[PDB]
Design a protein around this ligand. Structure first.
Ligand SMILES: [Mg+2]
Ligand SMILES: [Zn+2]
Ligand SMILES: [Zn+2]
Ligand SMILES: [Zn+2]
Ligand SMILES: [Zn+2]
Ligand SMILES: [Zn+2]
Lengths: 280, 183, 132, 106, 92, 189, 180, 49, 110, 46
């Protein structure tokens, strides 16, 4: 394409250098410092470059230049891809091969399969499941500790204002309590440490990050997840003891038993998201 | 078991030899060093709390010591030497001249940077105080796992093959049978 | 298995390639040339001590399994080999002639012949803070 | 505690040792009692000091428990001894320098 | 020809210490292909767990997982893992 | 960091790592939300991964105190490799290579400590004593096998590893009065 | 201090202004030794004042061993006079003292390692090499050799006054580290 | 925890468009860039202040 | 949080893949990148005007990000360039390049 | 009357501090435990 991809652009003449975010560094203790494999591979490209530049500038010995060119060719090439068929791998002192860019995107656990198409998440919780003849089909027994950690951001409104103020007063340690207060201003109030955690006076529009409570809709899931029924919306039921309790008849869709199975819990953060769960 | 420092050790309070045994166990030292207890077991449908591979335990028996166990975890730490000048230190860090302190408490530390054995600990608390001077100094201390707690069993101070001061801390808990507990 | 390797296999490994020689044959111009030499280095019997430890302050002493596990050491013993260095020489066809060295620390397998705990009685092990 | 057993292992056993509860009805539940922790009106204080003087294994029995609190002259806190030889419950075994010094609040 | 300068002790000492520690049965901190898991930390959960670890067999890479007739009296017909290593980890 | 609302000179702030927040301990205002695990982050640089399967392992640790900042990989054999291209690309690294080779005098110190039964902390002091005095005009033209024999007693005299000068005379080499003057011109530096 | 260092040796140079045949000097002068294979100069000594001269082919010489400025100039004149008496157009020129050495005895012992640790920037003490402590004084620029015995050596001076000023400056610190 | 590929699928099966967006954005990764309207690149030097 | 920008919030409707014209790579770039040195202004504690932030992205809880400022939790990080001594093949397209040569005249370009 | 460490075998109240190495009077056995804390520890009776 004459605009976006002329064939002349396939060959590399100039090299875009990625910024630190793409190749982070870490400064440990003044005699320990960690650089990313790319920063290594780049330095080789550079060194090989600086070398070949000096050779061309000086008396070009033809065959000592093309010798230095196919070194540069290697470093640049091995930087984008280190798993090249026929070629030797660029290795990093310890004997391990350099993590090329290709290789960061490639596999499951790559940037695609493992950071975009699936990623770990916050408002998640996991524990051993156990059955209960006294839970209703659609509910899920949630351990007090798990309820006390997972939070729902509720907007201060005339309807909830008084209730919310009470959970705020209750605080992070009591069971129907709250963890944070989010002001209009954007800054987060930590009820655990704020000197004003007592005398906290709410304003319509603020958000109270309150504990997960009985009858909140939550996504319950048993992995693998080869089913839409492997992830279903349940009513919370805060209970004692460290296990997620489920109604026995709901065992089959998840494909769960109580021989040591664990299950995942995800908490929606929006009125919209909650509706999605409860309604679909 | 009482004389060795291993990461993790699980010991049964009252082990029992099995009532039903193999002639081959004689050689396996099993009756001398057992892996369980002979429980009074009913195969019954009761409250339906034993459905799909779950079981009901006699809470009365659990109190009497049925299936309790000891638990020992061992935390280690080195006093590393980073070249000609930089040396880590065992001490109780002061929050004014020490960066990035742990929110946990440092009060249980004696001035040598260790908790004396016998003190009861708990989550996020600081077992071993360490700083990595760089300039005044950052905090390199060891806190107890946040999901655990117990009482410090033993604490030993040593030097290694080349003579780096390093310290091992044992923490003992007693794990009573609970709900999601596998058998 | 381990014992067979210590008592026999170890010696045969020291004796397969074993001896190595370097020959310095001159230019045969004139003195100081016209001098052809061949030097030998030979490996004889192999020795192996009981397990030991080399502390920071020079001193070497025996090391029991319990001290190894606690001070995070290696339960290894010393490997010693008889070395001999011969010298030979000719002028411008006739080769004419003109101790025990430490080589490494080999880790011992517990209860093997070389381990302290091998000839140990029940009461012995207990004093050694080992479990019988 | 210089014993082969854990502080809490021993502690657990001490609870399972039966104590005279004849006059239990004239003792208050500490929860209902008005002090700060415990007192005489609500508890029995037991003491246990044991040491391996003998070259042979030294045994620790429920008989080795001693009442240190004032009983208000009521039938309470006496370790129940049904044992023929009159020893009661075997709490622990000590060797030589094995010492066990503790205090119990019943 | 100074002897102490000639023979490097650290060669065989740390050369064995590496293998035994890490488990990559080969030379040395530049290992691959080297066979990892040859040396491993002894299971000390229960006494039986320790015993069965000192009688464990690894088979790296026709129908290997199946219990062969020739395994009679030599290898345990029951003691094998479930999944991936099933029938490739033999127990004496 | 200092709380914008309060501002007391000793700024009492906690790192609630578990909730991934940095809080002001007084007013409770959260001062930061993005918070990273330094232990696990350091696991990406110095790991146990020598095979090459870990996707987390993506960097390597270096030593800026001893070798400065010389980032450089090595052309070596991989799974699918012809033994030809390894030789050429290595014979090509030969033309691009003096003082970047005097680092093999660290291999002289390392092989001397291991022959003298010396700890890992002594070598790194002997290598830092040698790097900061081998190109000095104050040492000028001293016996080059007696200035590294003097920097080993300099590294031992700080790491508290007792080694007499006659103990290092037995190793190499040492000319006594020659490595005794050199042990003083460096001592001033 | 109450003590005055004793001048023990004075080194001076003298240009005789005229080339010399060392081989001839060695042949006609008594008490002369010439071994070009080791030193390209004739070594000659005289008894009054007791000194030793190093005579070069260039006509320049060094006179050593003199204990006073006068003895140094006087001895220098005698050597030149001999060179002349032998047959050279030698002349007494550019006389110049290049170094004066003096010694003392403060009479008391000295804890040297304490003095070295105290004045680390000026003193170098390592009994292994040399038993005395080397103190490099800044003003005046004089090097001192301090011994446990209380014996003091001062050198590097061009004027005898520098030896005296060097000793006065060091006496307080010597006294401070007296073993008593 | 990991809201992985197979979990994405279930959400896609349910038709939980907004629940998915939330899991992938608000509940994890989510970031804001400034892009150019001419060459749709993250080139923009946003001195937003 | 993450501070407000007056820029219009929009959604991505199309993604236009292509290759980088060296002219453009040069044009985007905010730094030359001349030296294989990381930071360490010879044994120091600051980045070298050469590799990472010669005039680039920002790190270590410090704003300095070339006027842009912001620092870590806002800065996307901007690119530098490196000027290569001679052309080299992009490993991915070693074959599309080959095929293009195979299709066209290696003298007139037709 | 106060203490610190112990012989892992000849158990003999030792005690020390900085640079005093880490040995024992006679038997070197550089192990040394650390003995209890005076402050009484309290326990649950169940
Ligand atoms: Mg199951
Ligand atoms: Zn009371
Ligand atoms: Zn643009
Ligand atoms: Zn920026
Ligand atoms: Zn054409
Ligand atoms: Zn002792």
């Amino acid at each position: 394409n004459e605009v976006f991809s002329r064939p002349e652009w396939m060959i590399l003449t100039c090299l875009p250098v990625p910024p630190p975010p793409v190749r982070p560094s870490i400064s440990f203790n003044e005699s320990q410092r960690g650089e990313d494999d790319l920063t290594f591979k780049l330095a080789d490209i550079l060194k090989a470059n600086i070398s070949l530049e000096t050779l061309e500038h000086n008396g070009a010995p033809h065959h000592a230049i093309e010798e230095a060119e196919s070194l540069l060719q290697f470093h640049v090439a091995t930087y984008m891809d280190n798993d090249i068929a026929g070629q030797p791998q660029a290795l990093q002192k310890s004997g391990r091969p350099v993590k090329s860019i290709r290789a960061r995107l490639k596999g499951k656990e790559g940037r695609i399969r493992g950071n975009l198409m699936g990623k770990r998440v916050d408002f998640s919780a996991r524990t051993v499941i156990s059955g209960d003849p006294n839970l209703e089909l659609d509910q899920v027994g949630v351990p007090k500790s798990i309820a006390k950690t997972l939070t729902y951001p509720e907007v201060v409104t005339p309807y909830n204002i008084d209730r919310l103020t009470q959970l705020v007063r209750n605080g992070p340690n009591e069971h129907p309590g709250a963890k944070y207060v989010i002001r209009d201003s954007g800054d987060r109030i930590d009820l655990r440490y704020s000197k004003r955690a007592g005398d906290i006076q709410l304003q319509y529009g603020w958000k109270v990050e309150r504990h997960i409570m009985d009858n909140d809709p939550v996504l319950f899931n048993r992995q693998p997840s080869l089913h839409k029924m492997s992830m279903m919306a349940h009513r919370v039921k805060v209970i004692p003891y460290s296990t997620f309790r489920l109604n026995l008849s709901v065992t089959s869709p998840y494909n769960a038993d109580f021989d040591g199975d664990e299950m995942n819990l995800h908490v929606p953060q929006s009125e919209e998201t909650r509706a999605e769960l409860s309604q679909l | 078991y009482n004389v060795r420092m291993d990461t993790m050790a699980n010991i049964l309070y009252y082990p029992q030899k099995p009532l039903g045994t193999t002639r081959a166990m004689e050689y396996l030292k099993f009756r001398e060093l057992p892996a369980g207890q002979n429980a009074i077991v009913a195969i019954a449908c009761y409250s339906g709390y034993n459905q799909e591979d779950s079981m009901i335990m006699n809470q009365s028996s659990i109190d009497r010591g049925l299936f309790r166990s000891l638990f020992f975890r061992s935390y280690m730490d080195q006093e590393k030497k980073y070249g000609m000048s930089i040396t880590e230190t065992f001490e109780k860090p002061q929050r004014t001249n020490t960066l990035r302190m742990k929110h946990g408490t440092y009060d249980k530390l004696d001035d040598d940077g260790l908790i004396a054995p016998g003190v009861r600990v708990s989550g996020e608390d600081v077992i071993i105080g360490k700083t990595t001077p760089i300039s005044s100094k950052r905090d390199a201390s060891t806190p107890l796992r946040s999901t655990e707690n117990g009482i410090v069993d033993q604490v030993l101070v040593t030097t290694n093959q080349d003579g780096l001061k390093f310290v091992k801390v044992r923490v003992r808990t007693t794990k009573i049978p609970q709900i999601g507990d596998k058998f | 298995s381990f014992n067979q390797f210590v008592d026999y296999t170890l010696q045969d490994i020291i004796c397969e390639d074993s001896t190595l020689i370097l020959e310095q044959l001159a230019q045969h111009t004139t003195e100081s040339d016209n001098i052809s030499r061949k030097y030998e280095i030979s490996f004889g019997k192999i020795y192996v001590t009981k397990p030991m430890v080399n502390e920071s302050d020079g001193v070497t002493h025996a090391l029991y399994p319990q001290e190894a596990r606690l001070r995070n050491l290696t339960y290894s013993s010393g490997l010693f080999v008889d070395v001999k260095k011969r010298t030979y020489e000719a002028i411008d066809e006739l080769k004419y002639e003109l101790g025990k060295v430490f080589i490494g620390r080999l880790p011992i397998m517990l209860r093997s012949k070389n381990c302290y705990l091998s000839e140990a009685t029940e009461s012995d092990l207990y004093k050694l803070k080992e479990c019988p | 505690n210089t014993t082969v057993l854990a502080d809490e292992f021993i502690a657990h056993r001490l609870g399972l040792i039966p104590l005279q509860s004849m006059d239990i009805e004239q003792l208050e539940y500490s929860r209902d009692c008005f002090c700060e922790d415990h007192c005489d009106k609500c508890s029995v204080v037991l003491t246990l000091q044991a040491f391996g003087e003998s070259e042979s294994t030294t045994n620790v029995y429920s008989k080795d428990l001693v009442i240190v609190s004032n009983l208000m002259g009521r039938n309470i806190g006496h370790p129940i001894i049904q044992d023929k030889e009159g020893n009661g419950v075997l709490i622990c075994k000590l060797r030589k320098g094995q010492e066990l010094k503790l205090t119990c609040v019943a | 020809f100074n002897m102490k300068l000639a023979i490097n002790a650290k060669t065989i000492t740390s050369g064995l210490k590496y293998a035994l520690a890490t488990g990559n049965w080969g030379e040395q901190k530049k290992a691959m292909s080297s066979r990892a898991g040859v040396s491993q930390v002894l299971n000390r959960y229960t006494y039986s767990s320790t015993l069965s670890h000192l009688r464990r067999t690894n088979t790296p890479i026709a129908k290997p997982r199946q219990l062969h007739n020739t395994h009679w009296g030599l290898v345990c017909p029951a003691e094998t893992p479930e999944g991936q290593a099933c029938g490739l980890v033999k127990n004496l | 960091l200092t709380c914008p609302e309060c501002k007391v000179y000793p700024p009492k702030i906690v790192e609630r790592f578990s909730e991934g927040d940095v809080v002001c301990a007084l007013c409770g205002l959260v001062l930061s939300d993005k918070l990273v695990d330094t232990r696990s982050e350091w696991r990406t640089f110095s790991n146990d991964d020598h095979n090459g399967d870990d996707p987390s392992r993506v960097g390597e640790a270096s030593n800026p105190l001893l070798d400065g900042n010389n980032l450089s990989t090595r052309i070596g054999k991989g799974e699918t490799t012809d033994m030809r291209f390894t030789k050429e690309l290595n014979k090509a690294q030969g033309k691009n290579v003096k003082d970047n080779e005097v680092q093999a005098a660290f291999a002289k110190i390392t092989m001397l400590c291991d022959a003298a039964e010396l700890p890992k902390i002594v070598k790194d002091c002997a290598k830092e004593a040698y790097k900061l005095c081998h190109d000095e005009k104050t040492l000028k033209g001293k016996s080059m096998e007696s200035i590294m024999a003097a920097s080993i007693l300099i590294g031992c005299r700080r790491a508290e590893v007792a080694r007499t000068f006659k103990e290092i005379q037995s190793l190499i080499h040492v000319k006594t009065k020659e490595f005794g003057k050199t042990l003083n011109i460096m001592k001033n530096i | 201090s109450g003590i005055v260092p004793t001048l023990q040796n004075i080194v001076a140079t003298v240009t005789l202004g005229c080339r010399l045949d060392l081989k001839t000097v060695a042949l006609h002068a008594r008490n002369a030794e010439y071994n070009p294979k080791r030193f390209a100069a004739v070594i000659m000594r005289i008894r009054e004042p007791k000194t030793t001269a190093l005579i070069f082919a260039s006509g320049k010489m060094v006179v050593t061993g003199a204990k006073s400025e006068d003895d140094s100039k006087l001895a220098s004149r005698k050597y030149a006079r001999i060179i002349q008496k032998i047959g050279f157009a030698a002349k007494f020129t550019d006389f110049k003292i290049q170094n004066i050495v003096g010694s003392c005895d403060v009479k008391f012992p000295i804890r040297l390692e304490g003095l070295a640790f105290s004045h680390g920037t000026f003193s170098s003490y390592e009994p292994e090499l040399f038993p005395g402590l080397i103190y490099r004084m800044v003003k005046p620029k004089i090097v001192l050799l301090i011994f446990v015995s209380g014996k003091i050596v001062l050198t590097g001076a061009k004027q005898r006054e520098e030896i005296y000023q060097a000793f006065e400056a060091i006496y307080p610190v010597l006294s401070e580290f007296r073993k008593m | 925890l990991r809201f992985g590929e197979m979990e994405r699928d279930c959400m896609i099966a349910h038709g939980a468009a907004s629940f998915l967006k939330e899991r992938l954005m608000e509940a994890s990764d989510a970031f804001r860039v400034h892009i150019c309207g001419i060459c749709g690149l993250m080139t923009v030097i946003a001195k937003l202040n | 949080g993450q501070q407000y920008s007056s820029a219009p919030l929009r959604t991505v409707k199309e993604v236009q893949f292509g290759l980088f014209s060296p002219e453009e790579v040069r044009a985007i770039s905010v730094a030359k990148i001349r030296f294989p040195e990381t930071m360490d202004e010879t044994q120091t504690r600051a980045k070298i005007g050469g590799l990472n932030d010669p005039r680039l992205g920002s790190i270590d809880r410090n704003l300095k990000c070339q006027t842009c400022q912001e620092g870590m939790n806002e800065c996307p990080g901007h690119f530098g360039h490196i000027d290569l001594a001679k052309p080299v093949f992009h490993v991915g397209f070693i074959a599309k390049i080959k095929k293009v040569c195979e299709c066209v005249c290696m003298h007139c370009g037709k | 009357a106060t203490l610190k460490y112990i012989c892992a075998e000849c158990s003999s109240k030792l005690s020390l501090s900085r640079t005093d190495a880490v040995r024992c009077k006679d038997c070197g056995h550089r192990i040394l435990l650390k003995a209890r804390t005076k402050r009484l520890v309290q326990f649950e009776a169940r």
